[PDB]
Amino acid sequence: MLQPKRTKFRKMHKGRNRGLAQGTDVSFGSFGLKAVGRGRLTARQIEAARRAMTRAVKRQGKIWIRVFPDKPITEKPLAVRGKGKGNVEYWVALIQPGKVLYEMDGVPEELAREAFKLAAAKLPIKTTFVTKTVM
Amino acid sequence: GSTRNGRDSEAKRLGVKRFGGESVLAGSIIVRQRGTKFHAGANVGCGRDHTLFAKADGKVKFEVKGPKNRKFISIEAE
Amino acid sequence: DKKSARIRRATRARRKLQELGATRLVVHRTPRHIYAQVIAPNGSEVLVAASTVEKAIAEQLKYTGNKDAAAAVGKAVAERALEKGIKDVSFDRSGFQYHGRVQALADAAREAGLQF
């Protein structure tokens, strides 16, 4: 479960999530899982997908996670009415279309495709399989 | 529960009062600022709170001058 | 660096003089020579000048790098300025202490007629 070791501030404005992603190329491995949709990825989701991927490849090759959950999300407890911002409960990464979420190397393409499909089944956002390009 | 926040200070109405090319009388405030984001040029004074004000009648002129690319305000005599 | 230190020393007074729009009497001192210039308020035009590297001044001096030479240069620059009809300047010690040769030059210029 990824989460910043420390932060300047405990709570963050909701903000919005417009635009296209930066970091749209396979930069470290040979294969990638890329977001086609827009949304939030919780640390639990990132880790559930990481587990699925890693077990699919039998801990062979190498795996990079290109996104990090650095945005804290607060909630108000049940049966509370104002009275200040709620408590931080989990952490998310904001995802825009085109964002490469994970990369893989050191395995055959068919196995990478299978592992990535198993991983995408854990995620709330539509994704697509990509490969490294020379330019 | 309750919050430990909830405080603020009154707005200080700083900023540029007379923009480039405006005709002003001597004494007119040109900019209110904390410290010297803008610096005093010809016919301009810098007060104790770093307010820049006209020392002569004329037209406001902004420029960038010197080795540090600093911003100066002067008054062109009209 | 000695030169950079002296330039830093001189900058505040020079900026004040420019802001005041004064006509400067700028002095430059070296171990061997002393120089004086009268500079217009724009800072880029020289009205009169005098130094110990001029033959007409250096030929009358035993040594060009002492208080007597400084006084001669001060008197000469003041006389040339008065001939041009200036009469009103501000002294610019250029980061040198107001002392010794620099002071002797200034005193000679004052005696010869420059008002500062």
Binding site: L20, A21, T24, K34, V36, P97, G98, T128, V134, M135 | - | -
Partner: protein, 94 residues
Amino acid sequence: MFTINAEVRKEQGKGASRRLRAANKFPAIIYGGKEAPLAIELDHDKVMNMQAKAEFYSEVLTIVVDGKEIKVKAQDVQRHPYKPKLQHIDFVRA
């Protein structure tokens, strides 16, 4: 052996470029040397099939525009953020 047929662009900017890509072409630029840059339109399907070969980015290509042949090298490519499509290509005169 790579040959690409191109047209000179008669309209530039965001609206014209989006209309090109909606008509299944895409814009590109040729620059370098002492000649002025040339803004061209390319057929997306043909060029997208060609650039799948790794030699597209290492060989000396020939662009035929208005009959004249220009020798170029692919210099930069802007891809669609998530579709398998091309937005733009820089070509440098060889």
